Structure formats: C-alpha cells, structure tokens
Amino acid sequence: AIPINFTISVTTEILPVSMTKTSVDCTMYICGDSTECSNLLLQYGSFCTQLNRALTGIAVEQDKNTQEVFAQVKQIYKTPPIKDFGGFNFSQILPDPSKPSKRSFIEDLLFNKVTKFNGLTVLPPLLTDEMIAQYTSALLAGTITSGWTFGAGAALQIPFAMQMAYRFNGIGVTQNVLYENQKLIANQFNSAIGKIQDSLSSTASALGKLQDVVNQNAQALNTLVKQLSSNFGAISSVLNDILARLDPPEAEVQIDRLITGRLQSLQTYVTQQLIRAAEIRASANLAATKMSECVLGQSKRVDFCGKGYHLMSFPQSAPHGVVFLHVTYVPAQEKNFTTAPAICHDGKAHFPREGVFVSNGTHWFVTQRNFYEPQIITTHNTFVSGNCDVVIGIVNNTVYDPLQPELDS
Amino acid sequence: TLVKQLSSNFGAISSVLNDILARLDPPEAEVQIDRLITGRLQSLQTYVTQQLIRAAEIRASANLAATKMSECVLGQSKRVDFCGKGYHLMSFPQSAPHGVVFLHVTYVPAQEKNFTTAPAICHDGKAHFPREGVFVSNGTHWFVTQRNFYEPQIITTHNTFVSGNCDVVIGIVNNTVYDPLQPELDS
Amino acid sequence: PPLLTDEMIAQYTSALLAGTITSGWTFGAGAALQIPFAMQMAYRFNGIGV
Amino acid sequence: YEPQIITTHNTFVSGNCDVVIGIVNNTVYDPLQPELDS
Amino acid sequence: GVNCTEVPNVFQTRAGCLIGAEHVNNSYECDIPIGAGICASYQTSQSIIAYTMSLGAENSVAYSNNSI
Ligand SMILES: *[C@@H]1O[C@H](CO)[C@@H](O[C@@H]2O[C@H](CO)[C@@H](O)[C@H](O)[C@H]2NC(C)=O)[C@H](O)[C@H]1NC(C)=O
Ligand SMILES: *[C@@H]1O[C@H](CO)[C@@H](O[C@@H]2O[C@H](CO)[C@@H](O)[C@H](O)[C@H]2NC(C)=O)[C@H](O)[C@H]1NC(C)=O
Ligand SMILES: *[C@@H]1O[C@H](CO)[C@@H](O[C@@H]2O[C@H](CO)[C@@H](O)[C@H](O)[C@H]2NC(C)=O)[C@H](O)[C@H]1NC(C)=O
Ligand SMILES: *[C@@H]1O[C@H](CO)[C@@H](O[C@@H]2O[C@H](CO)[C@@H](O)[C@H](O)[C@H]2NC(C)=O)[C@H](O)[C@H]1NC(C)=O
Ligand SMILES: *[C@@H]1O[C@H](CO)[C@@H](O[C@@H]2O[C@H](CO)[C@@H](O)[C@H](O)[C@H]2NC(C)=O)[C@H](O)[C@H]1NC(C)=O
Ligand SMILES: *[C@@H]1O[C@H](CO)[C@@H](O[C@@H]2O[C@H](CO)[C@@H](O)[C@H](O)[C@H]2NC(C)=O)[C@H](O)[C@H]1NC(C)=O
Ligand SMILES: *[C@@H]1O[C@H](CO)[C@@H](O[C@@H]2O[C@H](CO)[C@@H](O)[C@H](O)[C@H]2NC(C)=O)[C@H](O)[C@H]1NC(C)=O
Ligand SMILES: *[C@@H]1O[C@H](CO)[C@@H](O[C@@H]2O[C@H](CO)[C@@H](O)[C@H](O)[C@H]2NC(C)=O)[C@H](O)[C@H]1NC(C)=O
Ligand SMILES: *[C@@H]1O[C@H](CO)[C@@H](O[C@@H]2O[C@H](CO)[C@@H](O)[C@H](O)[C@H]2NC(C)=O)[C@H](O)[C@H]1NC(C)=O
Ligand SMILES: *[C@@H]1O[C@H](CO)[C@@H](O)[C@H](O)[C@H]1NC(C)=O
Ligand SMILES: *[C@@H]1O[C@H](CO)[C@@H](O)[C@H](O)[C@H]1NC(C)=O
Ligand SMILES: *[C@@H]1O[C@H](CO)[C@@H](O)[C@H](O)[C@H]1NC(C)=O
Ligand SMILES: *[C@@H]1O[C@H](CO)[C@@H](O)[C@H](O)[C@H]1NC(C)=O
C-alpha cells in the first residue's frame, strides 16, 4: 500500500513552565506582631528560618526555569518588512504593532482565555511577559528567515521555499514534490492556521493544562489561610484576644498549643509546595528540550514533537507556560499496488536503492516511499548482487539500459 | 542545622536531659521530657523528608547524565543542542568528585559569504534538480554545492535528476547543464 | 479498582503488536500502509547502514 | 564484509593526490571504458 | 505595587522602591535580578545604577527570495 496524496496538518501543544512565586513569612503567619509570641517562638529551634530558606528557593527556581526555556536564543532577530514568503502566510502568528503590547493574535487569544493580611506576599516575576513575548517573536523571525542554521551560530538567511524543500528532504520525500505542489501546500497551511485561530477563539477552555497549576496553588493557599480560624484546643482562636484576656503566667499555656498547631500547618504547606515545583521543573526541562530540538531544528525521532512526520514548529507564549504549533506531513489517500523484492534481469538480480518496486498490473515501476511518483526501471536507481536464485520470492521483468540506445546512435 | 537543634528547649526547662534528670525524677520528668522528645523527633523527621526530595533531584540529574553518556560518548547524536552547542562531532568524559564532566567537541561554521540561489535549471524544456545541496552563483557560473561548506563544482547530469517540465514550478532559471558523456563520446 | 481492566490492556497490547507486525512504523503517523514483513525487515536493515 | 571493485559508481573525485596523508596508488576501474569499444 | 511614600536618592519599581540607585536611561546585558525588568549594577564618579534590562543585541537579518 502506498499513498497518492497527503495533507499538511497543524496541531497545538501546551506546557506548564513555571508558577507564581509566593512567599509566606514566619513571624507574621504564626502570630504577627505579638512580641509575647515572638519571645515564645525564638527559643523553638531554627525551624522557620529554614522554612523561609526553602520557600525562597522555590521562588528563585521559577525564574531559572523561565530563562532556561525562553532564553535559548542569544540575540534579537526580527522579520523583514516585505512579507513575500512565497505564498505561505504566517501573518497571524507574527506580531502586529498596533496591538497594545507586542503580543500577537494567537498570543492575545491565549491571554484572554485564561484568568494579604498574613505575611504571605506574591513576588513579581523577573521577566515581564512583554519580554517573554519579545523572545518568542525573536524565535519566530529566526526560524522563519534564517532557516534552521541559527541552531549553530550566526544566522544564515535562505529563502523559505528552499528551506521547506530541505525539510521534506529530511523525511525522505525528494525535493520536487514541494515545488510541483507549492500552491496547494500553501493553501493547506493557511486554512490550518485559520482553523487553529477559530478553534481556540471558539474552543472550550481546552488550555486546561495551564489551569491546573494555578488552581492547585490557589486552593492550597486557601487552606493555609483558613487554617488560622481553628481554636486548636486553646481558649479562643483570635490571638489578639488570648493575649488581651488571660494573665501572662496563664497566657503561655494557651499560646503554646496555638503555636504548635500553626507551625505544623505551615510545615505541611511547605512540604506540599516543594513537590509542586519539583514536578513543574520537570515539565520545564521537557519544554526546554522541545523548544531546542523542535524549533531550532528538526526531530527525526518519531512522535516526540506532534504526530505525523515532522516539518516545522513555531512557539507562542502563555501566562506561566508555553504553547507550540506543530506542522507535520501525513498521508491520507492511499491506493493498492502489487510488489516483489527484486527484478531478475539477464541472470542477475536487481534491488532498488531508495524506493520500492511497484506494479500497476502489467509493467513494473520504481517509486519513492511516501508519495507515489512512478518511474521506469533503469540501471541508475538499482544495483546488482549475484544471481536471481537465492533471493526468496522474485518476479521477472526487463531492466532498460540508459546507455545502449544512445550508444547505438 | 540538624545538630544545632540539640541546643534548644522546645518549651521545656532546659536543653539537656541530664539536668532534668537531676532536678526532678517523678512524673514531672515525664511532663517535661515529653517536649524534648517531640521536638527532637520533628527535627529528625523534617531532616529526612527534605533529604528525600533532594535525593529525587539528584536521581533526575543522574539519569540525565546516563542518557548523555550513552548518547554523546558511545555514538554520535543528532538531537540538536543536546551534546553542546553546534553540530556535534565527539565527546570525552572525565570524573569529578561526585559528578561527571563532559568535554563536547563541536563543529561550527563562522565566516559567511552570500550568493544567489535558484530552485532548478530548466533545459530543452526539462527541469534539473540537485541531488544534494543548493545551486549557487558568483554572478555568471552556476555551481552546485553542499549546504554547509562552500566548495563549488560544475553542474552535471551525474549530480542532479530530472522533472521534464519547467512551468508549474515557480521561480526557475535557465542555464546550460554540462554532460560528461558527450565529450567522451566524441571519440 | 483500576480504570482500564487488564483484559482491556491485553487488547491494546495485542493491537499495538498486530500493527507493528503487519504495517511497519507507518501506523504511528496516520493510517496503516501494508508492506510484507520480509521487505519491512529489509528496510529496517537499510535504516541502520546495511 | 562485501568486497567490490573500485569504479566511478562508488568513488568520487575531489582534488589532488599530494595533500592527503597516507594515500596509495591502485588502479581505479572505469566500466565505461570496456564499453568504450566503438 | 505599593507606594514608598510610606517609608519612615529614590526610585520606584513594580516590586517596591530601592533607595540609592541613580536611575539611568540606557540598558545593558544585566547582572543582578531586582524585579519586573529592573536590574542593578556597579559602574561609572562611580555608583550603583538600577535600570531597565535589555534582552540582547538587535541584528535584523536581510532576507530575499533569491539570496543565500
Ligand atoms: C495573509 O493572511 C491574512 C489573514 O487574514 C490576510 O489578511 C487580510 O488581508 C486583507 C487585505 O487584502 C484585509 O482586507 C483583511 O482584513 C485581512 N483579514 C482577513 C480575515 O481577510 C492577508 O491578505 C494574507 N496575505 C497577506 C499578503 O498578508
Ligand atoms: C491531492 O489532494 C489535494 C488536497 O488533499 C487535492 O487538492 C484539491 O483537489 C480537489 C479535487 O479535484 C480540487 O477540486 C481542488 O481544486 C484541489 N485544491 C486546490 C487548491 O486546487 C488534489 O486535487 C489531489 N490530487 C490528486 C491527484 O488526487
Ligand atoms: C499501467 O501502466 C502502463 C505503462 O504506462 C500503461 O500502459 C500504457 O497504455 C497506453 C494505452 O492504454 C499506451 O498508449 C501506452 O503506450 C502504455 N505504456 C507503455 C509503457 O507501454 C497502462 O495503461 C497502465 N494501466 C494498466 C491497467 O495496465
Ligand atoms: C505468499 O504466499 C503465497 C502462498 O499462497 C505464495 O504463492 C505462491 O504460489 C503458490 C500459491 O498457490 C504456492 O504453491 C507457491 O509455493 C507460492 N510461492 C511462495 C514463494 O510462497 C506467494 O509467492 C508468497 N509471496 C511471496 C512474495 O513469495
Ligand atoms: C551580501 O550581503 C551584503 C549585505 O546586504 C551585501 O552588501 C552590499 O552589496 C552592495 C551591492 O553589491 C554593495 O554595493 C555594498 O557595498 C555592500 N555592502 C557592504 C557593507 O559591503 C552584498 O551585496 C550581498 N552579496 C551579494 C552578492 O549581493
Ligand atoms: C523575488 O522578489 C523580487 C523582489 O521584488 C521580485 O522582483 C520582481 O520580479 C519581477 C519578475 O521577475 C519583475 O518584473 C519586477 O520588476 C521585480 N521587482 C522589481 C522591484 O524590480 C521577484 O519577482 C521575486 N521572485 C519571484 C520568483 O517572484
Ligand atoms: C532561458 O533560455 C531559454 C533557452 O533559449 C529561453 O527560453 C525561452 O523562453 C521564452 C519565454 O516565454 C519563450 O518564449 C521561448 O520560446 C523560450 N525559448 C527560446 C529559444 O527563446 C530563454 O532565453 C530563457 N527563458 C527565460 C524564461 O528567461
Ligand atoms: C604509519 O606508521 C608507521 C609506523 O611508525 C610509519 O612507518 C614509518 O614511516 C616512515 C616514512 O616516512 C619511515 O621513514 C619509517 O622508517 C617508518 N617506521 C619504521 C619503524 O620503519 C608510517 O610512515 C605511517 N604511515 C605513513 C603514511 O607515514
Ligand atoms: C604512486 O604512483 C605514482 C605514479 O604511478 C608514483 O609516482 C612516481 O614518483 C616518482 C618520484 O619520486 C617518479 O620518479 C616516478 O616516475 C613516478 N611514477 C612511478 C610509476 O613510480 C608514486 O611514487 C606512487 N606512490 C607510492 C607511494 O609508491
Ligand atoms: C524468468 O526469466 C528467465 C530468463 O530466461 C527464465 O529462464 C525464467 O524461466 C523466468 N521465470 C519464469 C517463472 O518463467
Ligand atoms: C566565478 O568563478 C569562476 C571560477 O570557476 C571565475 O573564473 C569567474 O570569474 C567568477 N565570476 C565572478 C563574477 O566572480
Ligand atoms: C503610588 O504610586 C503610583 C504610581 O506612581 C501613583 O499613581 C499614586 O498616586 C501613588 N500614591 C500616592 C498616595 O502617592
Ligand atoms: C533619560 O533619557 C533621556 C533621553 O533623552 C536623557 O536625556 C536623560 O539624560 C535620561 N535620564 C538620565 C537620568 O540619564
């Protein structure tokens, strides 16, 4: 079986890359400006100092993640202002200046789809999502203009049609197929990108994978805050009343269980919050690998990078995450043929060198693998070894010589 | 930090167990040493858990190191930007205390001169394509070269193939293609 | 109890095996496109330099 | 292991002989020439 | 995002107000992470200057349907 006809296909892909960098403090959470409590805690061990340690560790880890995944470029390339990319039309994913910040249409959709008293603050990230967008625009202009050469170093421009010819050549579909079908492939590309647009705008919230990081973290914070309302066995929950009601020599007692309960709650919180990030950065490392292998090059590794055979990938940002577009080659309309391993001619077998030997019923032909393109059998594309007896299973045919009739001139 | 935790009372009378032994042996010794034990037990447990997480981290890095060894060393990879930066030639390992140190030997092209390209060279109505590499021009003499290092050669049937029409394809140029069999057939 | 049931998992392993016996790798990219086993093994050998 | 004769259909030509290290002579075969009998 | 007029040179950031840096109007491939784009350095008479970061050099490549 072999395919007559094929479709370019465009798939989306989502990934978490980081999460909001909270930071909740010791003395405020536990008791918050009640120096009686402070004097009671100072002689507990060095617990909460090193809690603060761990948590700020998570916080710096987040921006380490974002810089490993996005700063995989070294400069800022930008696209030339004459959009003559040979039929292919990326105008939906490149920037548009009159959008307020330098987002892009699909970026802006992704942004519009997804949506204090207790010492617990939220630091701001170290890259501004504007800068993130500027990186991704740089990556787009890079992998578009310069081919994929800039994987190595100084970018080396090369026209887009040539580049996609090389992309095809990297999955065993000889160059010509592109040039002969350029217009068709271009229209396919365009309608696919447009379908992505209209899907995402009218999709369900199927950016859900980024939703889960934020929902989990925020519900954990709700539990931590709410925990402050439990008596924990003391006279009353509110510390400003326990202090202001009982005598000191009595106070120490009722404050004791309150301190131990709130500490144990804080430790449970930080213990879970460590594992949150310890898996987020696994995802982040996966995103860095996908970015470099897919965007700055081509991946011969079947189904690492969106399915079908692989051609090109484009990145886009998202709030605390990244979103790839994968552009792949897939065969759709197949058809029957009957084959055999080798062609015995004049007492010597022949095997083909790249493509399969294929028949339409009467004659025989040589074709490449993944897109039907019949040809005659000539000494050029085949090669010989030995008789035609050992090779199990065989069918007879005539091998034409591209030299004899020209020689017979 | 763990050891320092032994110098703290956790809300008892002292930071040593022997003194509480000396002062008060009957039940109040229980209602005090209770706190020493509880606190010290936490400190140990909360050492163990974060040590366990750090262990997860080091195992992740160890498995990355294993894959990197058995791809960069024992073979030649084509995952791009895995073994270093640039096209990958080779690697050698070295061993540092508690870790490993890879020397990646990579091949990177630096000087760049530009030319003019073209998809195909129609002739007699048929269109040649290169077997590998692009066509290229210094202005007059079209040469065909591999994509990654400038060394030109003369265009030939033997390093091209055919598609017998030059109209559907967009952006062709015209030029003679050389043929080695004709001059050797002149004899 | 688990969601997929070990009988169902056996059906997936049977299918994912039948595919690779009959049609080579192709059924990971689209629809299966048949080649006879011997030829498929020949093309694997070609894929590793022999 | 699979010995073959050395001809134009399995070797290409790059440049001069006297710059590569440790080259040797041997007679390249040109299977056009036996057919170059006319 | 709160006001440092409430503090008991001077600047303002999306993360707070840092006290001491001369705020400048050129951007460098910058060292120290402060916040939300602001990032400091010791340079030149000499002091600490806190300033907007810049993601890198700009090299807009020339491109043309028949170059290489
Ligand atoms: C590339 O695709 C975009 C996608 O819309 C095309 O944009 C339209 O361009 C026309 C100009 O002829 C405008 O009047 C429309 O408002 C644009 N949008 C739509 C939805 O039609 C664009 O024409 C295509 N080609 C180029 C060269 O940009
Ligand atoms: C191969 O497939 C492509 C699309 O999958 C076909 O393109 C369209 O085919 C229909 C059917 O005749 C035409 O009406 C359309 O005009 C074609 N599209 C364009 C943009 O022209 C293509 O015809 C198929 N070719 C073969 C030989 O099957
Ligand atoms: C199978 O392929 C052969 C090869 O092209 C086709 O045979 C051609 O048939 C037409 C008339 O039907 C002749 O004018 C051509 O000269 C034939 N070609 C050759 C090379 O002899 C054949 O039609 C195809 N289909 C079938 C069912 O056999
Ligand atoms: C596939 O197996 C069939 C078996 O039916 C082979 O058919 C040949 O012809 C008849 C079938 O009635 C048998 O007596 C022969 O022994 C079969 N030959 C062989 C080699 O099996 C068919 O040839 C086989 N396919 C290939 C490619 O060998
Ligand atoms: C390679 O790219 C450079 C950069 O655009 C081109 O440089 C200019 O080319 C024009 C036309 O010959 C000259 O008049 C200028 O003096 C060049 N600029 C410099 C700084 O030297 C160059 O032309 C391109 N190569 C070709 C063959 O066109
Ligand atoms: C590549 O881009 C250039 C840039 O405009 C195109 O140049 C035009 O080419 C046509 C036909 O070759 C001429 O009639 C025009 O006069 C050219 N433009 C100018 C300003 O002189 C060129 O056509 C493009 N290549 C292709 C294949 O379309
Ligand atoms: C390239 O060289 C060929 C070789 O003569 C010529 O092709 C002519 O192209 C024009 C363009 O329509 C045709 O009208 C002629 O019939 C073609 N043949 C001849 C003999 O003139 C022409 O010199 C060049 N072609 C182009 C498109 O530049
Ligand atoms: C391969 O190694 C051998 C062993 O050293 C080299 O043999 C020497 O070759 C030089 C040629 O300039 C002679 O003068 C020496 O006498 C040789 N050594 C001995 C022990 O006789 C050989 O040269 C090397 N290969 C090449 C191409 O130089
Ligand atoms: C390879 O063969 C060539 C020619 O067949 C040898 O070239 C000889 O070079 C010497 C100079 O030292 C001349 O005196 C000879 O006349 C040349 N020809 C022959 C046939 O000897 C060359 O020496 C050979 N290389 C080796 C390593 O033997
Ligand atoms: C295949 O062709 C050879 C060439 O003469 C012939 O001897 C042999 O009988 C043919 N095979 C069959 C099955 O007829
Ligand atoms: C192109 O290169 C050839 C060398 O084969 C040379 O002789 C010719 O003058 C060159 N043309 C230009 C315009 O540099
Ligand atoms: C706080 O700073 C913002 C930003 O400069 C400003 O708009 C606002 O007026 C300030 N608030 C006060 C009370 O000065
Ligand atoms: C701010 O930028 C303007 C731009 O002209 C410059 O004149 C001014 O000196 C800059 N401010 C400082 C403190 O350098």
Author numbering:
A (entry chain C): 713 to 827, 854 to 1147
B (entry chain B): 961 to 1147
C (entry chain A): 862 to 911
D (entry chain A): 1110 to 1147
E (entry chain B): 614 to 621, 641 to 676, 689 to 712
Structure paper excerpt:
In the S-ACE2 complex structure, the interface between the S RBD and human ACE2 is clearly discernible, suggesting that the two proteins form a stable binding state in the absence of any crosslinker. Our complex structure suggested that the B.1.1.7 S may maintain a more favorable conformation in advance before hACE2 engagement. Despite this possibility, few changes were found at the RBD-hACE2 interface in our complex structure.
The rapid spread of B.1.1.7 has increased concern about those natural mutations in the S protein, including 69–70 deletion, 144 deletion, N501Y, A570D, D614G, P681H, T716I, S982A, and D1118H. To improve protein stability for cryo-EM data processing, proline substitutions at K986 and V987 and a “GSAS” substitution at the furin cleavage site (S1/S2 site, R682 to R685) were introduced into the purified S protein, according to a previous report.
